[PDB]
Amino acid sequence: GSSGSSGQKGRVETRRVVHIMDFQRGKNLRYQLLQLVEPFGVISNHLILNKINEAFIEMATTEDAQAAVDYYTTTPALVFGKPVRVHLSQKYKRIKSGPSSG
């Protein structure tokens, strides 16, 4: 579209938000995406927009999410059989909160 800038950079240990795109949906989709981090760590909170193929998964430890990414650079992440995109973003302070809030 008309939103995005180029420029590479090192690494940073801040929160955990693995962005996944180019992924399709169908039967047990939420799992197809969560399976990209599940075996990489624990699931804290995920998010799947019902508008486009944009989803974000939050891990309990940045160490996990970060790892899930190193798997996309070394190994091709084929979702549902087709290739996709995986990145290590850092948004959504708290995708979800606890019931503690009267």
Swiss-Prot record:
Domain RRM: where?
16-91
Highest rank taxon of the organism: Eukaryota
Summarizing the function annotation, the protein's role is: May play a role in transcription or may interact with other nuclear matrix proteins to form the internal fibrogranular network. In association with the SFPQ-NONO heteromer may play a role in nuclear retention of defective RNAs. Plays a role in the regulation of DNA virus-mediated innate immune response by assembling into the HDP-RNP complex, a complex that serves as a platform for IRF3 phosphorylation and subsequent innate immune response activation through the cGAS-STING pathway.
Protein name listed in UniProt: Matrin-3
In terms of the whole protein, what range is present? 390 to 478 of 846
What gene is it encoded by?
Answer: Matr3
- Where in the cell? Nucleus matrix
Q: Where is this cross-link: Glycyl lysine isopeptide (Lys-Gly) (interchain with G-Cter in SUMO2)?
A: K96
Can you state the subunit structure given in the record?
Part of a complex consisting of SFPQ, NONO and MATR3. Interacts with AGO1 and AGO2. Part of a complex composed at least of ASH2L, EMSY, HCFC1, HSPA8, CCAR2, MATR3, MKI67, RBBP5, TUBB2A, WDR5 and ZNF335; this complex may have a histone H3-specific methyltransferase activity. Interacts with TARDBP. Part of the HDP-RNP complex composed of at least HEXIM1, PRKDC, XRCC5, XRCC6, paraspeckle proteins (SFPQ, NONO, PSPC1, RBM14, and MATR3) and NEAT1 RNA. Interacts with FUS. Interacts with IGF2BP1. Interacts with IGF2BP2 and IGF2BP3. Interacts with RBPMS.
